[PDB]
CSV table of C-alpha atoms and ligand atoms in Angstrom, one decimal:
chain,number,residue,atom,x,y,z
A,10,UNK,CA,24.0,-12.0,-20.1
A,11,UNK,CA,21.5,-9.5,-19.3
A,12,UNK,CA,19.5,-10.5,-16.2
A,13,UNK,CA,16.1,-8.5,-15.8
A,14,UNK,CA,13.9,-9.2,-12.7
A,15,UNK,CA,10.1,-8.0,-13.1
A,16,UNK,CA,8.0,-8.2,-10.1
A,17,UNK,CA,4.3,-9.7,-10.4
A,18,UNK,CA,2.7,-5.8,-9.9
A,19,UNK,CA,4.1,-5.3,-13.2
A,20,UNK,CA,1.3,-5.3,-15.8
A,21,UNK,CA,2.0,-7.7,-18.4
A,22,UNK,CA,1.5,-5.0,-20.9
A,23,UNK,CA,4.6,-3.2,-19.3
A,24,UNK,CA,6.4,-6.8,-19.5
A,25,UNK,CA,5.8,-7.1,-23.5
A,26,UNK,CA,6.9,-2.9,-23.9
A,27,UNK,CA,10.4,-3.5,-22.2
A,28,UNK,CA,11.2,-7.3,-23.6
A,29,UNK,CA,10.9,-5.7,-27.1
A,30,UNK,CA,12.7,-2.8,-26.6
A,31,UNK,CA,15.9,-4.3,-24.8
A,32,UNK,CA,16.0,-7.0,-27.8
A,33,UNK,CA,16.9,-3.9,-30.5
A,34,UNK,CA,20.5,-3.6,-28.6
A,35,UNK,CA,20.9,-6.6,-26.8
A,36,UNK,CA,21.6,-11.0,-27.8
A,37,UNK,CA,21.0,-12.9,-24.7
A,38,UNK,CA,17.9,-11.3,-21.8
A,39,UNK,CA,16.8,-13.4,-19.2
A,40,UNK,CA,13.5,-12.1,-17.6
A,41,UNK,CA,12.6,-13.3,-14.1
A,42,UNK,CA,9.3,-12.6,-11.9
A,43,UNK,CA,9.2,-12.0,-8.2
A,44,UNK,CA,6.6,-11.0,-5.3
A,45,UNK,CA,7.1,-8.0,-5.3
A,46,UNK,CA,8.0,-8.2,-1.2
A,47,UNK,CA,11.0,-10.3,-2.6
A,48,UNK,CA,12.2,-8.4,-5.6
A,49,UNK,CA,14.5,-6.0,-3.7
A,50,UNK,CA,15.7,-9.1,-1.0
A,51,UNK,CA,17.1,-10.2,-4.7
A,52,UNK,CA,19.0,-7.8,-6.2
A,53,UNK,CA,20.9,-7.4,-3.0
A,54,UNK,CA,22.2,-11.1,-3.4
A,55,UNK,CA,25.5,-10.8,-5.6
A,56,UNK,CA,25.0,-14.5,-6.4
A,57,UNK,CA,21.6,-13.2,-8.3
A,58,UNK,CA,23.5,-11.2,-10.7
A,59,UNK,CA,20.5,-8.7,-11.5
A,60,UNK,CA,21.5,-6.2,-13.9
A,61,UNK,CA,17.9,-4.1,-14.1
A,62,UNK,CA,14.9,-5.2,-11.3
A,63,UNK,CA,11.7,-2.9,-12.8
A,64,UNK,CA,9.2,-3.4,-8.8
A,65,UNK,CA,7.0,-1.3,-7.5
A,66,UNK,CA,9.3,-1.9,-4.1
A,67,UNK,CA,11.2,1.4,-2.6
A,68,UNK,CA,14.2,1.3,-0.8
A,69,UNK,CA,16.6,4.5,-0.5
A,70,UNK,CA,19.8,3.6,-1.7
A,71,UNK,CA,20.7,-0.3,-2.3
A,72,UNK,CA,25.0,-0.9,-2.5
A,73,UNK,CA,25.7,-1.1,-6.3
A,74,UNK,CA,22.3,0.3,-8.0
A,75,UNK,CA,20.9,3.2,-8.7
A,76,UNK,CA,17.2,4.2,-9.2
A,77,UNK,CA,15.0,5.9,-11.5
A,78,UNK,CA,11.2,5.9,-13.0
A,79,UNK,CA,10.1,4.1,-15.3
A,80,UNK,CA,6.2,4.9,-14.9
A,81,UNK,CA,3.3,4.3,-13.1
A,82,UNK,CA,0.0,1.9,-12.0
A,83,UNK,CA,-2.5,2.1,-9.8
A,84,UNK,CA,-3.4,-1.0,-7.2
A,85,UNK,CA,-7.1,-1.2,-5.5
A,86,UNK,CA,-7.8,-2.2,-2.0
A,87,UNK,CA,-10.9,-5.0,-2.6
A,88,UNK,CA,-13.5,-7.5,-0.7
A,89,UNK,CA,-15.9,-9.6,-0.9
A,90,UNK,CA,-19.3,-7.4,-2.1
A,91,UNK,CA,-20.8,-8.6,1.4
A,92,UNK,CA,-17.4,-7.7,3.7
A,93,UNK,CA,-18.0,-5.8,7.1
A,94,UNK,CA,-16.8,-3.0,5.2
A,95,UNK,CA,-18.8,-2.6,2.5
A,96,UNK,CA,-20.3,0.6,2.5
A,97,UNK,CA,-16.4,2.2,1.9
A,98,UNK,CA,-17.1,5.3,4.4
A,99,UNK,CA,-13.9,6.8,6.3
A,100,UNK,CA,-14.9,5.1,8.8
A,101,UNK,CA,-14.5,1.6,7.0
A,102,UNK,CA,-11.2,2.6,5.5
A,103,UNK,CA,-9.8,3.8,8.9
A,104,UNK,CA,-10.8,0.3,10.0
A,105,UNK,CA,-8.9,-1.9,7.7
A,106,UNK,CA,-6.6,-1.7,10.5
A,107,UNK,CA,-8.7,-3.8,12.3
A,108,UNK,CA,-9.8,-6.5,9.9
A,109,UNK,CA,-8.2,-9.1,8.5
A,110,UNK,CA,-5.6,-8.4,5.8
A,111,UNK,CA,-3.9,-10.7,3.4
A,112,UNK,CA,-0.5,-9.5,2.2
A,113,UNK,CA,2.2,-11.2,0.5
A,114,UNK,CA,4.6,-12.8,2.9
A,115,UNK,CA,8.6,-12.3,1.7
A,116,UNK,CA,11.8,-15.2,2.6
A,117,UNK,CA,13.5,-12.5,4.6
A,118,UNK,CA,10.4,-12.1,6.4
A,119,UNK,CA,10.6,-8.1,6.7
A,120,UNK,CA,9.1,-5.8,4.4
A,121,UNK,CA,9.3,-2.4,3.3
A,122,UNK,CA,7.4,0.9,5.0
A,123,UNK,CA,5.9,1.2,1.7
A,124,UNK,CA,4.7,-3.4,1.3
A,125,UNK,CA,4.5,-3.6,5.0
A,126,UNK,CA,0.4,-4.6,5.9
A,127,UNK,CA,-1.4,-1.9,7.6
A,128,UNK,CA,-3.6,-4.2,9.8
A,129,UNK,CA,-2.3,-6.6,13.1
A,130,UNK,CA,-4.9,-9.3,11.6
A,131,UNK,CA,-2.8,-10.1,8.6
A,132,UNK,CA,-2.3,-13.8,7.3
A,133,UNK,CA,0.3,-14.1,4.2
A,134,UNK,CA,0.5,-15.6,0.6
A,135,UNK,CA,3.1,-15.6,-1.9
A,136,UNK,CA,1.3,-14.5,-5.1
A,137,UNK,CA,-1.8,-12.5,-6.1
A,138,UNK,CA,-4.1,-15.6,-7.3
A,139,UNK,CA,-3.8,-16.8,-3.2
A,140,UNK,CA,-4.6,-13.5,-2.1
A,141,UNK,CA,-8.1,-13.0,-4.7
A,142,UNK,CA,-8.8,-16.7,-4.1
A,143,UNK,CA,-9.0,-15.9,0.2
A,144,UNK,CA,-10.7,-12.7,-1.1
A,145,UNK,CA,-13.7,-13.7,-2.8
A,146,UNK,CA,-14.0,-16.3,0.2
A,147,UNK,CA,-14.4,-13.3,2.2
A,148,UNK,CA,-11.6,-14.6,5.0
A,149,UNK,CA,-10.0,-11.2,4.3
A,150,UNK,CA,-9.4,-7.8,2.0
A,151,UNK,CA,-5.7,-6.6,0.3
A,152,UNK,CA,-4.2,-4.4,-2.0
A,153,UNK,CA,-3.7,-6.0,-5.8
A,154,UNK,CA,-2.5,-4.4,-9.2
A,155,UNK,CA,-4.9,-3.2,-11.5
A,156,UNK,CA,-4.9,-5.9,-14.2
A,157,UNK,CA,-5.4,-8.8,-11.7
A,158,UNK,CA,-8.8,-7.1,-10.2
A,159,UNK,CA,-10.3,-5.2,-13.4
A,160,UNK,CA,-12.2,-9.1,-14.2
A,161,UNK,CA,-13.7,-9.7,-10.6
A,162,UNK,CA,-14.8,-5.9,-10.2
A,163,UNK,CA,-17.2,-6.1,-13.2
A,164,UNK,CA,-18.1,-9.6,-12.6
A,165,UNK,CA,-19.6,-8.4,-9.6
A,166,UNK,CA,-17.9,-11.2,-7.8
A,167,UNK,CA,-15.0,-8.3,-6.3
A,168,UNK,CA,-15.7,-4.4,-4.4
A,169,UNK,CA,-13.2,-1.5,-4.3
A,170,UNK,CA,-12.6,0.2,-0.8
A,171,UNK,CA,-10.0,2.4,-1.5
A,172,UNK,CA,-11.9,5.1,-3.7
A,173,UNK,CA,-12.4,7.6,-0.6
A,174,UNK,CA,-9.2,7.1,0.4
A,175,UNK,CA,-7.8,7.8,-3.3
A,176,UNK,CA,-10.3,8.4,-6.4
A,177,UNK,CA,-9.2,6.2,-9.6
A,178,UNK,CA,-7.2,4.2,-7.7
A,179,UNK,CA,-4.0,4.3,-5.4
A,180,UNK,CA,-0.9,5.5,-8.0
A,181,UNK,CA,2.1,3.5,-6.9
A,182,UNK,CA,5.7,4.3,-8.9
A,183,UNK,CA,6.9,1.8,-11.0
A,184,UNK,CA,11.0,1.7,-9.9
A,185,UNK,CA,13.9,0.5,-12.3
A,186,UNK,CA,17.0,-0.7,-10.2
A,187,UNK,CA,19.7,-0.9,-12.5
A,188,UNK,CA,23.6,-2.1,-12.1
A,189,UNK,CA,25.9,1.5,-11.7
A,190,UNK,CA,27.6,-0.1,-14.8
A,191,UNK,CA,25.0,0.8,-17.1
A,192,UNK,CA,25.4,4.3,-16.8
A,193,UNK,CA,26.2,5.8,-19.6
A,194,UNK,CA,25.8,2.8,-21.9
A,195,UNK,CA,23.7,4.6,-24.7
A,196,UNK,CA,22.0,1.1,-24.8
A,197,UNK,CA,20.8,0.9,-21.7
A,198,UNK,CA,19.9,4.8,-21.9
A,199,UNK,CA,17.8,3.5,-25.4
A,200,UNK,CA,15.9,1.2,-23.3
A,201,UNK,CA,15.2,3.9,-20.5
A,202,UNK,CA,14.0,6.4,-23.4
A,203,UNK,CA,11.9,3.9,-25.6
A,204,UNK,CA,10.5,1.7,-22.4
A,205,UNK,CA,9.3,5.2,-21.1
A,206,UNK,CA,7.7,6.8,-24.0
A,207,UNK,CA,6.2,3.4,-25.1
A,208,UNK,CA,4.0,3.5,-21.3
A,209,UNK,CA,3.2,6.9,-22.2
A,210,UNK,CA,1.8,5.9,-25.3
A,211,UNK,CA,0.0,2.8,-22.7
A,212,UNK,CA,-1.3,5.9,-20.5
B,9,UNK,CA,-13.1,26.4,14.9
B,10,UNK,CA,-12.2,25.1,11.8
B,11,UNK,CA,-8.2,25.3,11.8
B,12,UNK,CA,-6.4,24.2,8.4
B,13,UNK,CA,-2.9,23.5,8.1
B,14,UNK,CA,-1.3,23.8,4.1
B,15,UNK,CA,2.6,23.2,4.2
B,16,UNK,CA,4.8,25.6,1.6
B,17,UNK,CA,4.9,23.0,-1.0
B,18,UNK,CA,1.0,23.2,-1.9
B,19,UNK,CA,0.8,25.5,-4.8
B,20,UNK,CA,-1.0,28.9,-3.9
B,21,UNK,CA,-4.0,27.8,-6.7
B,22,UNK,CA,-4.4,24.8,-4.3
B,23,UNK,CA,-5.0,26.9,-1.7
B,24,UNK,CA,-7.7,29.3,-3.0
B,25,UNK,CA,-9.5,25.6,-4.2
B,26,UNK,CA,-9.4,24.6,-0.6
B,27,UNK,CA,-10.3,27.9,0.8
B,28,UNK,CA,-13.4,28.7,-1.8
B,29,UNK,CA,-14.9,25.0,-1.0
B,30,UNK,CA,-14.6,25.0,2.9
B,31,UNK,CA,-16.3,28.6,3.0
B,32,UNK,CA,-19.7,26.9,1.8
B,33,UNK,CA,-20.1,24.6,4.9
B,34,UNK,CA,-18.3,26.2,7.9
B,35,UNK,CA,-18.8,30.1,9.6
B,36,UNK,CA,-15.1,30.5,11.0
B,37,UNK,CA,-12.0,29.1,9.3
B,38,UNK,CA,-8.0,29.2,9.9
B,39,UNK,CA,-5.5,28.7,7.9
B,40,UNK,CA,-2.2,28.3,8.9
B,41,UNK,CA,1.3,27.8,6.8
B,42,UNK,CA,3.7,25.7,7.5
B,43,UNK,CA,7.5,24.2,6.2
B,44,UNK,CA,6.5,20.5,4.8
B,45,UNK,CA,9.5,19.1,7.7
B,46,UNK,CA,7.2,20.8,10.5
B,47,UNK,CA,3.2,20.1,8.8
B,48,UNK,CA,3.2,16.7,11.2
B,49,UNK,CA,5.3,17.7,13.6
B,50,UNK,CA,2.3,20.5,14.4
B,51,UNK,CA,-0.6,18.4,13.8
B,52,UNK,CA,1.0,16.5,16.6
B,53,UNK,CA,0.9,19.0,19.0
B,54,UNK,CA,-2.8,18.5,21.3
B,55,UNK,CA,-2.8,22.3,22.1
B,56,UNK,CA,-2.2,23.3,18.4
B,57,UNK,CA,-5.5,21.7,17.4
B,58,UNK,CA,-5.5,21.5,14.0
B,59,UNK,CA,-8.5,19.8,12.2
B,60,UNK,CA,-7.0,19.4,8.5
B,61,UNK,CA,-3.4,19.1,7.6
B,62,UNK,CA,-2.5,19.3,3.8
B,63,UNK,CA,0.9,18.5,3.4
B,64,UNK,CA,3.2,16.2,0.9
B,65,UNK,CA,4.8,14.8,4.4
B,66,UNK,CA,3.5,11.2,4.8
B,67,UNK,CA,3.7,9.1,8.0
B,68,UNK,CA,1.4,5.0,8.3
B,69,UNK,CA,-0.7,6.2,11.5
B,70,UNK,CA,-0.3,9.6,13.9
B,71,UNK,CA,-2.9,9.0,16.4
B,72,UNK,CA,-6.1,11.1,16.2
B,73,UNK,CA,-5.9,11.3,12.1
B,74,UNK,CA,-7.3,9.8,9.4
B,75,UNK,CA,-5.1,10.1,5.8
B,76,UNK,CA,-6.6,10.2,2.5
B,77,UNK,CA,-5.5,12.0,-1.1
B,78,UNK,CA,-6.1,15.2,-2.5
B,79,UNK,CA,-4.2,15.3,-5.6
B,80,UNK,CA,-0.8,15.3,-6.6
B,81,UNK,CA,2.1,17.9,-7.2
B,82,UNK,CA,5.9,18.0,-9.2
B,83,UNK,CA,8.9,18.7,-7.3
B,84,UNK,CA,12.1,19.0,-9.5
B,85,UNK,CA,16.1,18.8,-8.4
B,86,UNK,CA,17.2,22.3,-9.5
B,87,UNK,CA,20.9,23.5,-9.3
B,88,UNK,CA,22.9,26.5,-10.9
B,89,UNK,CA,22.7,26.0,-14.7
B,90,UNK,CA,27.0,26.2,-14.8
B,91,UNK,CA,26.7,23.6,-11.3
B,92,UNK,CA,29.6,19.9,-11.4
B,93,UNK,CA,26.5,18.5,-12.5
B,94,UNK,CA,25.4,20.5,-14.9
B,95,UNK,CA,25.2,17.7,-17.5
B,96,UNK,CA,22.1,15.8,-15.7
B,97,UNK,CA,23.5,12.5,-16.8
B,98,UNK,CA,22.4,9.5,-14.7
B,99,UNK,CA,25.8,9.5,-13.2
B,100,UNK,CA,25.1,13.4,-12.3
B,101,UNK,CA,22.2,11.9,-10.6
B,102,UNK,CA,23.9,9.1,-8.5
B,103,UNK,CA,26.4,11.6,-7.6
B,104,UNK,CA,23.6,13.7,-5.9
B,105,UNK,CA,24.4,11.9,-2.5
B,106,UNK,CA,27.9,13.2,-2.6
B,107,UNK,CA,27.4,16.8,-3.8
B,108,UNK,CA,25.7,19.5,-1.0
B,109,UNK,CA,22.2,19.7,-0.6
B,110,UNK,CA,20.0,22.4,0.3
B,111,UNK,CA,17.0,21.0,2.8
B,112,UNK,CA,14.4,22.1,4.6
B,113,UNK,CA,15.0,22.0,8.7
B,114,UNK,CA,12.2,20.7,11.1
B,115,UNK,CA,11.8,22.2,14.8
B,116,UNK,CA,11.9,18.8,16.1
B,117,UNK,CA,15.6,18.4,13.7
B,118,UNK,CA,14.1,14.4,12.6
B,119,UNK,CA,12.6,13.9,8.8
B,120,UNK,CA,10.3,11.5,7.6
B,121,UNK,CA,12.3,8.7,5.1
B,122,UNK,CA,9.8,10.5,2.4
B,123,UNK,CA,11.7,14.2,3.6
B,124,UNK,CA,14.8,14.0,4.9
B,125,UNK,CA,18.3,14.6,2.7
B,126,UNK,CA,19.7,12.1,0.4
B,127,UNK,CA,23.2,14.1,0.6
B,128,UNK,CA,26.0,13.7,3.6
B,129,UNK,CA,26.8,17.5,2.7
B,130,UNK,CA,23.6,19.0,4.0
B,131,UNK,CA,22.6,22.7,4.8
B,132,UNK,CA,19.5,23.5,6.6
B,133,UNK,CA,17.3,26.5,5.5
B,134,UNK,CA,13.1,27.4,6.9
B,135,UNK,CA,11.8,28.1,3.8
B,136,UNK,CA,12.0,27.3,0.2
B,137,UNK,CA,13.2,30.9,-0.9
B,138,UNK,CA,16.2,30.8,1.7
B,139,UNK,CA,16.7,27.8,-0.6
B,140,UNK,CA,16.7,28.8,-4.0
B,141,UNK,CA,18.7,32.4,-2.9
B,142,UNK,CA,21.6,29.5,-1.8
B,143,UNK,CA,20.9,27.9,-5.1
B,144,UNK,CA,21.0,30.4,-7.8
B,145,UNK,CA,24.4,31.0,-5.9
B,146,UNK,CA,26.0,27.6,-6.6
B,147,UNK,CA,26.1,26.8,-2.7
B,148,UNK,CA,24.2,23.5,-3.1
B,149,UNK,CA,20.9,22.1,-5.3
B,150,UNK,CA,17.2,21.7,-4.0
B,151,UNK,CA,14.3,19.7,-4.6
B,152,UNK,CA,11.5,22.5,-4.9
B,153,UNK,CA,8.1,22.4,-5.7
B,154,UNK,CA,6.7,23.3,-9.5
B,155,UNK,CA,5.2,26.6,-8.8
B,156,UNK,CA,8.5,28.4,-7.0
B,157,UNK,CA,10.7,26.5,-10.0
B,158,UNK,CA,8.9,27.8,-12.8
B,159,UNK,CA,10.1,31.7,-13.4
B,160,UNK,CA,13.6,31.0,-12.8
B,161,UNK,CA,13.5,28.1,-15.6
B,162,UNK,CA,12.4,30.3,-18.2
B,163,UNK,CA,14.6,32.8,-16.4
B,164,UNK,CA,17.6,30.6,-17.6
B,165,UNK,CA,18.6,31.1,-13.6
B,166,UNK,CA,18.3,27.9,-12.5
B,167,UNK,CA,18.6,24.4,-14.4
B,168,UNK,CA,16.8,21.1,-13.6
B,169,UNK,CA,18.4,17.8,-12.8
B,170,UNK,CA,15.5,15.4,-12.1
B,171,UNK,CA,14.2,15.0,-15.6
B,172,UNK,CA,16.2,11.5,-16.1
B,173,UNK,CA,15.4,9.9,-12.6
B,174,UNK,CA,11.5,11.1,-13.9
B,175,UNK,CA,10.3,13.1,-16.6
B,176,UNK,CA,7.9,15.5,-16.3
B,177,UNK,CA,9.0,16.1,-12.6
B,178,UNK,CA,9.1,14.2,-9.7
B,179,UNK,CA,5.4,13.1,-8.6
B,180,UNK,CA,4.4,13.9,-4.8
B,181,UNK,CA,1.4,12.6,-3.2
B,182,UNK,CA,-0.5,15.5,-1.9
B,183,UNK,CA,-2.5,14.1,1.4
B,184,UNK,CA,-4.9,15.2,3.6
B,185,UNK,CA,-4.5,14.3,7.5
B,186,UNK,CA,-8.1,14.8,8.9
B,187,UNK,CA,-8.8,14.3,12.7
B,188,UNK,CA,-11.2,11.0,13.0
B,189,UNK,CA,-14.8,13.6,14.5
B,190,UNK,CA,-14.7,14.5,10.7
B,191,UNK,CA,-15.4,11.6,9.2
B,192,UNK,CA,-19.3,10.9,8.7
B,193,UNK,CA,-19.4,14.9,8.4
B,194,UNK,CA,-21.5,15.8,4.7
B,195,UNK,CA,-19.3,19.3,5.6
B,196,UNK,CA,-16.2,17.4,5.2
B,197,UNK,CA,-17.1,14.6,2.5
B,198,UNK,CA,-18.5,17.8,0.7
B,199,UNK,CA,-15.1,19.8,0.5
B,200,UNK,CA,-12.8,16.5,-0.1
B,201,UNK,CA,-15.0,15.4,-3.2
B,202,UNK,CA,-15.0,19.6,-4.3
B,203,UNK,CA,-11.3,20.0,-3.5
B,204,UNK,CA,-10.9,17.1,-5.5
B,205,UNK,CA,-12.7,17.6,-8.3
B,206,UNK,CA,-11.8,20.6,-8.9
B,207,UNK,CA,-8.3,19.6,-8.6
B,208,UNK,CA,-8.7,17.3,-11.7
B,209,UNK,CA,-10.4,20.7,-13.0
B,210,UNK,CA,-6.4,22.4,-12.3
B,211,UNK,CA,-5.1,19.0,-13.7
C,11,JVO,C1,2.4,0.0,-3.0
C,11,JVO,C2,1.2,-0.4,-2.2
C,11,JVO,C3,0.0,0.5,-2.5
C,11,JVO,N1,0.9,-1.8,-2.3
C,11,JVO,C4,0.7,-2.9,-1.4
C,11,JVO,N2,0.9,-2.9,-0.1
C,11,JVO,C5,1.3,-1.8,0.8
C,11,JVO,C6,0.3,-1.7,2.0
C,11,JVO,O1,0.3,-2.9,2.8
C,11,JVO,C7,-1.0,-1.3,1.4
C,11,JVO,O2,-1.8,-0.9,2.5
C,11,JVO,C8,-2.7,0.1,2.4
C,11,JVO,C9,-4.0,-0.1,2.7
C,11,JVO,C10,-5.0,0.9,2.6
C,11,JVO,C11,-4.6,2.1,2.2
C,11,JVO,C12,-5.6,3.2,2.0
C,11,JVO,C13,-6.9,2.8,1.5
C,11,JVO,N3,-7.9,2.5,0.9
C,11,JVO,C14,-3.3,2.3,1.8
C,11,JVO,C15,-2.3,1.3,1.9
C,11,JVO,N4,0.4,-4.0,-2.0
C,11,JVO,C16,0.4,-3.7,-3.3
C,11,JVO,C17,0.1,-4.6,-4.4
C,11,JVO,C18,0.1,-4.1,-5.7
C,11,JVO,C19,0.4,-2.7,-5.9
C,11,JVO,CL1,0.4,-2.2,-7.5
C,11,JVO,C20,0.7,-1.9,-4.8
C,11,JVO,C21,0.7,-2.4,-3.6
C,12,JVO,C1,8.7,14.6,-1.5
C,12,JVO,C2,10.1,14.9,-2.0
C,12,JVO,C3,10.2,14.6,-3.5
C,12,JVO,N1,10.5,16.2,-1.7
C,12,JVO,C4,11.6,16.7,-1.0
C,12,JVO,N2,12.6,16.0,-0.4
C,12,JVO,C5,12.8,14.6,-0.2
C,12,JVO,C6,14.2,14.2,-0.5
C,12,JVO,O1,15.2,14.9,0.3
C,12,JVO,C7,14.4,14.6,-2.0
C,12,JVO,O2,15.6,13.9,-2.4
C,12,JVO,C8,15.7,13.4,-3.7
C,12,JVO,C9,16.7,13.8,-4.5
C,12,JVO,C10,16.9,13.2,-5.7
C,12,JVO,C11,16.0,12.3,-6.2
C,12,JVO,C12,16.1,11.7,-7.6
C,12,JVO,C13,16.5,12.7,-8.6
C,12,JVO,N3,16.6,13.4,-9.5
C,12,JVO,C14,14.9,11.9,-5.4
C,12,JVO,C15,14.8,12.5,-4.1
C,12,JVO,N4,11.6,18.0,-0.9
C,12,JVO,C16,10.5,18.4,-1.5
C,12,JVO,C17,10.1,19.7,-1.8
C,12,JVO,C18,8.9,19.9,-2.5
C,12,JVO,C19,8.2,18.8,-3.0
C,12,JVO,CL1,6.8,19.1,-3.9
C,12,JVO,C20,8.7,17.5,-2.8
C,12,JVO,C21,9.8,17.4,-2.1
């Protein structure tokens, strides 16, 4: 009745915050998760019949949805502890360009300016566990949310390289794609207002 | 010797932060103002020779530069407070791509995706005071940064649009575009970690 797709970038926290709000006004919700590389390819099949896609995804203008904001989170660039580019100089960040990146692959196959890997050496996945798993085996380093890195950083068994390049971590917008219908539905305006000031109260 | 670009959409405190820091290290300095839609454009230019760009324009790779973040900033929508869209309803929002737009123009006339106007009724302007003179006169609406927003808020003047597509303002990535010599520099690892710091002293 109420289709909601919630990419895999999305801390679970945020997943628990919006679930409980939309159940105040609404009967039937069906939540979904996508990569986040796929979560806009989704939406845009009218098949799908996605009413609200919350993705970390940008695109400008998609045919019958609008965007807004519902917050933000903050993804880390990681290694293994022993990777070429340990150290995390400039010089080391520059040259992820160079070494091997793994990025999550999407069914379209294209990707975003904003998903797209940085680096010619790239070799897919289609989750975040495949991507830490090749990670740790140092075969690679990629970009990963917050809450799926936080563990392996003070295990010692994961290292941050994208301090220099951004102190605390690289903010990335958290989107909400929502059906032009649900414009001026005070419901869906409730959810907006509560989901919001419910991740303020998170950050 | 040292040349510094800082676009029109750094706030002025930003710029004494910058200019303070860099004075420590370096004997000779330059620094040089520039619309946001010509910052990359310049850096561009061999001849110009530019050293450090700081500018809310982003593009993935020019060739001689390095990017990395400073901080961030607030741009807000802002039209006349009697504008169509006076309401700032999400609708009001979506409707912003039909409405005119007031933009910056680039010397070059192309705009990064990150840049260029979301409107089809577009009209050009160099600076951001050409824009709010058009916009206090119902002409069109702007996206203008913070500090150049602020008086004619609380001046009643000018009303803002953005608050429902993201409270608080719209957050902009301020970056740095370094040229490649300066990394491995303690000069210029010195004045990103003071420009920063004291950055999260403003913030
Ligand atoms: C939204 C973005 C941050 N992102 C990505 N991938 C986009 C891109 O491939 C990332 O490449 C970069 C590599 C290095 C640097 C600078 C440094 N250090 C910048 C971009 N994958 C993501 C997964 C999760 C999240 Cl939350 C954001 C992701
Ligand atoms: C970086 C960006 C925010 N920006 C721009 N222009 C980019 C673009 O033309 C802005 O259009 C938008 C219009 C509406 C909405 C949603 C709402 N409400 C989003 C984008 N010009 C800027 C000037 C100063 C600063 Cl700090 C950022 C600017």
């Amino acid at each position: 009745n109420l289709r909601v797709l919630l990419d895999t970038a999305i801390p679970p926290s945020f997943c628990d915050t919006v679930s409980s709000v939309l159940l105040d006004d609404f009967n039937m919700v069906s939540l979904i998760r996508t990569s986040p590389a796929d979560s806009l390819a989704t939406i845009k099949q009218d098949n799908a019949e996605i009413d609200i896609a919350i993705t970390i995804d940008e695109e400008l203008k998609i045919s019958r949805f609008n965007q807004c904001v519902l917050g933000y989170t903050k993804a880390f660039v990681v290694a293994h502890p022993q990777h070429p580019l340990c150290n995390a100089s400039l010089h080391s960040i520059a040259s992820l360009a160079n070494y091997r990146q793994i990025s999550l692959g999407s069914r379209s196959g294209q990707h975003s300016n904003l998903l797209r890997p940085v680096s010619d050496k790239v070799l897919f996945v289609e989750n975040f566990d495949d991507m830490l798993r090749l990670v740790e085996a140092g075969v690679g380093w990629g970009i990963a949310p917050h809450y799926f890195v936080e563990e392996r950083l003070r295990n010692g068994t994961l290292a941050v390289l994208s301090e220099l390049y951004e102190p605390g971590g690289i903010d990335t917008k958290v989107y909400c794609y929502y059906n032009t219908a649900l414009e001026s539905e005070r419901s869906f305006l409730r959810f907006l207002e509560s989901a919001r000031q419910r991740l303020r109260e998170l950050g």
